[PDB]
Specification:
Blueprint lengths: L4 H10 L10 H12 L6 E3 L5 E3 L4 E2 L29 H11 L9 H6 L15
Helix pairs in contact: 1-2
This protein binds chloride ion (CL) (2 copies) and sodium ion (NA) (2 copies).
The site of one sodium ion (NA) has 3 residues, from loops.
GO cellular component, one term: extracellular space
Catalytic activity: Hydrolysis of (1->4)-beta-linkages between N-acetylmuramic acid and N-acetyl-D-glucosamine residues in a peptidoglycan and between N-acetyl-D-glucosamine residues in chitodextrins
Pfam families: Lys
Length: about 130
Amino acid sequence: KVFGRCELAAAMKRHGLDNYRGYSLGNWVCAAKFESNFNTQATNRNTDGSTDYGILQINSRWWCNDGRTPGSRNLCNIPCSALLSSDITASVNCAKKIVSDGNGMNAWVAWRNRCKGTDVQAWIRGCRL
Ligand SMILES: [Cl-]
Ligand SMILES: [Cl-]
Ligand code: NA
Ligand code: NA
């Protein structure tokens, strides 16, 4: 599913991301925009052979099992395919573990390069949340 901006902001808020670990909702929506263009089915292969999955491009090296990333872990204890669902629950729950891991939203390189230090409230402006 390809979400609209406000639609995703609302779903993220319902699923508990608003100010989670201090990150306002606009940070999460901005990250999703540049990671996946709001498309739950987005996948992208990494140079190391791992793959990124779903609206927040969660990586198989650490976070989910895809059966083809040698030597990886599955810290969210889910198949990576669960991260492609129209239901964003698995992605949000796994994202909460990632953002708690020590480096905050810097785990998402696109957030660091394109969202960090910007007016992220713009991403939720006009939304009935
Ligand atoms: Cl990407
Ligand atoms: Cl694997
Ligand atoms: Na393997
Ligand atoms: Na932080």
